[PDB]
Amino acid sequence: KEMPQPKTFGELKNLPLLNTDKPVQALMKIADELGEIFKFEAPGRVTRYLSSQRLIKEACDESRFDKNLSQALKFVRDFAGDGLATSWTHEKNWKKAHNILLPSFSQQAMKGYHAMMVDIAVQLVQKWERLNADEHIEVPEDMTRLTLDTIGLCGFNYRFNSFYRDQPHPFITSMVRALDEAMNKLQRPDDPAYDENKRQFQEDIKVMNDLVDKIIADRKASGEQSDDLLTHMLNGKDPETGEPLDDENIRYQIITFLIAGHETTSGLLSFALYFLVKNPHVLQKAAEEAARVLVDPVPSYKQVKQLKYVGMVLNEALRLWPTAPAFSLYAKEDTVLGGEYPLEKGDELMVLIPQLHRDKTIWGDDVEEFRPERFENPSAIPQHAFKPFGNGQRACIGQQFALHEATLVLGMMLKHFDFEDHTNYELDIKETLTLKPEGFVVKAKSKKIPL
Amino acid sequence: KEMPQPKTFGELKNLPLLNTDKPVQALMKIADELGEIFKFEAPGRVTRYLSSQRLIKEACDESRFDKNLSQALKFVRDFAGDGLATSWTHEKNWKKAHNILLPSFSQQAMKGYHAMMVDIAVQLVQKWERLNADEHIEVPEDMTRLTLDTIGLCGFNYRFNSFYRDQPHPFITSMVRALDEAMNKLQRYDENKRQFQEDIKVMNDLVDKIIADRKASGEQSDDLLTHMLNGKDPETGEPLDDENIRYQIITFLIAGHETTSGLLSFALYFLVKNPHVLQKAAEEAARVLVDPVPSYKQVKQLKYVGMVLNEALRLWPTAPAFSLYAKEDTVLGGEYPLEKGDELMVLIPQLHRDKTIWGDDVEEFRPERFENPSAIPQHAFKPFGNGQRACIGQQFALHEATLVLGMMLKHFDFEDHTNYELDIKETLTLKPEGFVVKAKSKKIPL
Ligand code: HEM
Numbered sequence: 021k022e023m024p025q026p027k028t029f030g031e032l033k034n035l036p037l038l039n040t041d042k043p044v045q046a047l048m049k050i051a052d053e054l055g056e057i058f059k060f061e062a063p064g065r066v067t068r069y070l071s072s073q074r075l076i077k078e079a080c081d082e083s084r085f086d087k088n089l090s091q092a093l094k095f096v097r098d099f100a101g102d103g104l105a106t107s108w109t110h111e112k113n114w115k116k117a118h119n120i121l122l123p124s125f126s127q128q129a130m131k132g133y134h135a136m137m138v139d140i141a142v143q144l145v146q147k148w149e150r151l152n153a154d155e156h157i158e159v160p161e162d163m164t165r166l167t168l169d170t171i172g173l174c175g176f177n178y179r180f181n182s183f184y185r186d187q188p189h190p191f192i193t194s195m196v197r198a199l200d201e202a203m204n205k206l207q208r209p210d211d212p213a214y215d216e217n218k219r220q221f222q223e224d225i226k227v228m229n230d231l232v233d234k235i236i237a238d239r240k241a242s243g244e245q246s247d248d249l250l251t252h253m254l255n256g257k258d259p260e261t262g263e264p265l266d267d268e269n270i271r272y273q274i275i276t277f278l279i280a281g282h283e284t285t286s287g288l289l290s291f292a293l294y295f296l297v298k299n300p301h302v303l304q305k306a307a308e309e310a311a312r313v314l315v316d317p318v319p320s321y322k323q324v325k326q327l328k329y330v331g332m333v334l335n336e337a338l339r340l341w342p343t344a345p346a347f348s349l350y351a352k353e354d355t356v357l358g359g360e361y362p363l364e365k366g367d368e369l370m371v372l373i374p375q376l377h378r379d380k381t382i383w384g385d386d387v388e389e390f391r392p393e394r395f396e397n398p399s400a401i402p403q404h405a406f407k408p409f410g411n412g413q414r415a416c417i418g419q420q421f422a423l424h425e426a427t428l429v430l431g432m433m434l435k436h437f438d439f440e441d442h443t444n445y446e447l448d449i450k451e452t453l454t455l456k457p458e459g460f461v462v463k464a465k466s467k468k469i470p471l
Numbered sequence: 472k473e474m475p476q477p478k479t480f481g482e483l484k485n486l487p488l489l490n491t492d493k494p495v496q497a498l499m500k501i502a503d504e505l506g507e508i509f510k511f512e513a514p515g516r517v518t519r520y521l522s523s524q525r526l527i528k529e530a531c532d533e534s535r536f537d538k539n540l541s542q543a544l545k546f547v548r549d550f551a552g553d554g555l556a557t558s559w560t561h562e563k564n565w566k567k568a569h570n571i572l573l574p575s576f577s578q579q580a581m582k583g584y585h586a587m588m589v590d591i592a593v594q595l596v597q598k599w600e601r602l603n604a605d606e607h608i609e610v611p612e613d614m615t616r617l618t619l620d621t622i623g624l625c626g627f628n629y630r631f632n633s634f635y636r637d638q639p640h641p642f643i644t645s646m647v648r649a650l651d652e653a654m655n656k657l658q659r660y661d662e663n664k665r666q667f668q669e670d671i672k673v674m675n676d677l678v679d680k681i682i683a684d685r686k687a688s689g690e691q692s693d694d695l696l697t698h699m700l701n702g703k704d705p706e707t708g709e710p711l712d713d714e715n716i717r718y719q720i721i722t723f724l725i726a727g728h729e730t731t732s733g734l735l736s737f738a739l740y741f742l743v744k745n746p747h748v749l750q751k752a753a754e755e756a757a758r759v760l761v762d763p764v765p766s767y768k769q770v771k772q773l774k775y776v777g778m779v780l781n782e783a784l785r786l787w788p789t790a791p792a793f794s795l796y797a798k799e800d801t802v803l804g805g806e807y808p809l810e811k812g813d814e815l816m817v818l819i820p821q822l823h824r825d826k827t828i829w830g831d832d833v834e835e836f837r838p839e840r841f842e843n844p845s846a847i848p849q850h851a852f853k854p855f856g857n858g859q860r861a862c863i864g865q866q867f868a869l870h871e872a873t874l875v876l877g878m879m880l881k882h883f884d885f886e887d888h889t890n891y892e893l894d895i896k897e898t899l900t901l902k903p904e905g906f907v908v909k910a911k912s913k914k915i916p917l
């Protein structure tokens with residue numbers, strides 16, 4: 021009945037607890053101490069963090085709870101607009117864009133993106149083939165190059181050419197700095213010395229809008245048709261309203277794909293490779309499948325679907341470190357959670373995904389061990405125990421995209437290289453709005469298999 | 472390219488090879504002679520027995536192969552109906568019951584069955600505590616009493632009371648005799664047919680009555696029948712009808728009781744034949760089972776006992792084969808072209824003796840092989856089948872077997888007083904026939 025709550029800071033309540041460079045990991049430690057639910061109070065803000073499958077399965081009941089915009093999402097909305105990830109379910113543009121975009125993100129639609137994904141994947145493999153002896157790989161840096169370029173190519177047929185650069189394309193620099201400002205605002209009084217941050221923030225917003233608006237205008241003027249999401253959005257019509265997306269909303273969706281997809285997906289690849297080099301038996305099993313299945317110089321769509329164990333590796337990496345680590349809900353009406361926590365209409369909940377994925381009542385006592393064999397049969401996994409892609413109609417629309425991209429790329433990596441954890445890397449998880457293993461490095465020795 | 476085939480009998484092709492009292496063991500000997508794959512032809516039937524992890528890992532690719540009803544399963548279907556084990560994947564009632572029953576067979580659902588499992592396990596322990604000096608234990612007989620009563624209690628809150636009886640419950644007599652007819656038909660009568668239909672009626676009558684009684688009573692138990700009466704398939708939104716619920720109950724009794732008791736019997740056999748392994752398992756039992764009654768959490772802590780059971784399943788998987796068909800034209804192992812609909816048999820005991828996987832000591836009983844599941848290659852160990860058609864009762868069987876074996880090792884020292892010579896009797900399952908031991912109580916109260 022009485023809800024646990026972490027330490028307070030006078031008038032600031034719990035807010036200073038988030039003034040730390042690893043806030044998700046701090047919240048996990050608080051959940052370890054306080055249990056399946058704790059209250060978190062700030063000036064003008066109350067929320068409750070959920071960690072157990074017992075309570076989260078109720079929070080995922082869409083008749084009782086709807087997606088809430090967390091403070092992080094509200095700040096991202098300043099440049100993602102009413103894109104899919106930062107719009108309320110009741111906003112006309114959410115259901116409109118959802119209906120238009122769902123078929124172009126289906127498993128069947130990955131057949132059309134496959135060639136462009138292979139284009140960037142081959143660039144990554146060639147970069148590593150061309151490294152000299154005793155040079156090493158900066159894993160998240162290269163994974164982020166790959167996912168950004170892949171979303172750029174599949175999203176709107178634009179080549180960021182990240183593998184030709186040390187300093188990223190100006191759009192990426194402004195996007196990363198915009199996301200950084202959004203995160204920093206969470207841990208922040210509105211002192212006059214933040215005026216520089218604000219002026220830079222508006223400059224970065226303009227950089228993103230200008231490039232994306234320009235590409236949209238260029239595409240409309242040309243009339244050319246590609247296999248990208250931009251073509252689908254220029255030609256799609258919502259069956260419900262009968263309307264297409266307008267040019268401004270299309271821009272917000274493109275920005276959203278880049279934000280929502282690039283860092284989550286590169287983090288997944290980075291964590292997956294981290295767990296593989298730390299668990300050599302798993303690596304060997306995953307590399308055997310890669311060599312057996314990927315028998316052609318270029319992987320096909322059907323071959324990627326056959327990489328079952330690689331997919332199991334990715335799910336277990338998502339279990340331990342889900343790279344979009346939380347989502348927020350509000351109670352649609354007065355309701356009682358778990359039979360002991362009464363909630364009033366509008367009350368907010370946070371789903372702490374890494375804690376959910378460590379619920380021993382679901383996964384057993386070995387929750388911290390990396391064992392892809394947990395995912396041999398996904399249907400056996402209990403409902404709402406595994407939520408790396410969110411929930412319900414507000415779940416990740418790019419789930420099939422992210423997993424196809426990650427399975428293809430990891431499969432090619434395991435096919436073409438042996439990996440060495442040459443520094444005995446100590447896991448250090450850097451936190452933005454997503455999670456990544458900072459400073460993770462490996463050496464790759466080519467198996468000399470041509471492309 | 473050219474596929475080996477054992478000796479033929481003119482028009483009967485290979486069929487007379489199955490007219491033997493130990494057909495699985497005969498097929499294992501053929502696999503020893505012919506290798507990882509051989510064709511087996513009969514009048515109107517062609518199948519291919521696979522024995523190597525190399526080929527079986529491909530056969531377990533669900534995009535290329537689906538479960539086939541073997542001739543044995545087709546005959547069992549005459550009384551298991553479209554229960555889970557004897558239904559095709561494309562049958563509406565398979566996916567429906569699969570979705571409904573999966574949560575009631577989860578590791579989490581074992582917490583609710585644990586008390587009833589302990590009920591029967593304590594009865595087994597008390598039977599052995601009450602034996603007189605120089606009396607002995609008929610191991611598979613008592614293990615079958617236990618597994619039969621446990622599924623009856625957990626399945627539909629019914630007490631077969633096998634530990635109060637010499638002659639089994641009338642349902643069991645008809646079930647065993649029906650399974651006997653199903654097996655005999657493979658190696659093969661008006662009396663047999665009339666008896667077969669009588670046994671079907673006995674099974675249907677009792678199960679339909681228990682279902683009707685439960686609906687009339689309205690009572691709610693912690694059993695599978697309650698879940699099936701109240702469950703709805705999330706996909707179709709439909710519940711199982713009463714006829715299918717009956718077939719599921721019959722299936723649980725068939726699919727679970729003899730496989731699981733065979734596992735316990737083989738496990739105890741290997742333990743008494745390997746005293747160092749028994750001692751290690753007994754040491755774990757005494758360290759973990761510190762209360763008069765094991766808890767659910769304690770059973771999960773019996774790690775080495777779990778390895779013992781897995782190694783027993785490796786050597787003698789008690790459901791020794793399953794059947795697959797090719798969904799489309801495909802090439803197996805890069806040299807064996809298969810046409811759509813072509814059938815495969817997975818010879819599990821041979822798979823589990825693949826020296827390229829387990830090393831040269833494949834016949835030795837070493838639970839330590841199972842220290843890390845990640846070290847085992849994909850699809851090398853398949854005692855519970857494969858994919859979405861894998862054993863739904865796997866967590867049930869292993870929880871029951873781990874609980875019971877743990878209590879046995881806590882409460883008794885065992886003697887292989889006859890120096891028992893392994894003799895594996897074959898039905899549709901496997902068991903060490905005539906396996907007997909003496910148990911000396913450690914005098915630990917319950
Ligand atoms: C492994 C990689 C990814 C993970 C773990 C992930 C995770 C998530 C999660 C947890 C949500 C729910 C957020 C909430 O409820 O507030 C979400 C939503 C979303 N994601 Fe992802 N995501 C990934 C990749 C991608 C990719 C590649 C794309 C597109 C190119 C994408 C686009 C979106 C969109 C548009 C939404 C909002 C959908 C809606 O609410 O209508 N994501 N994602």
Ligand code: HEM
Pocket residue numbers: 538544555556557569622722723724726727728730731734788789790792793794853854855856857859860861862863864865867868
């Ligand atoms: C150690 C004991 C057991 C072993 C070795 C075993 C083995 C197997 C195997 C190999 C299959 C696949 C059959 C095929 O592909 O044709 C299977 C399926 C099945 N088993 Fe078990 N089993 C055991 C115990 C149990 C128990 C205790 C139950 C239930 C109480 C059970 C119920 C089932 C069912 C319903 C299926 C069919 C699942 C489906 O296709 O949806 N089994 N079992």
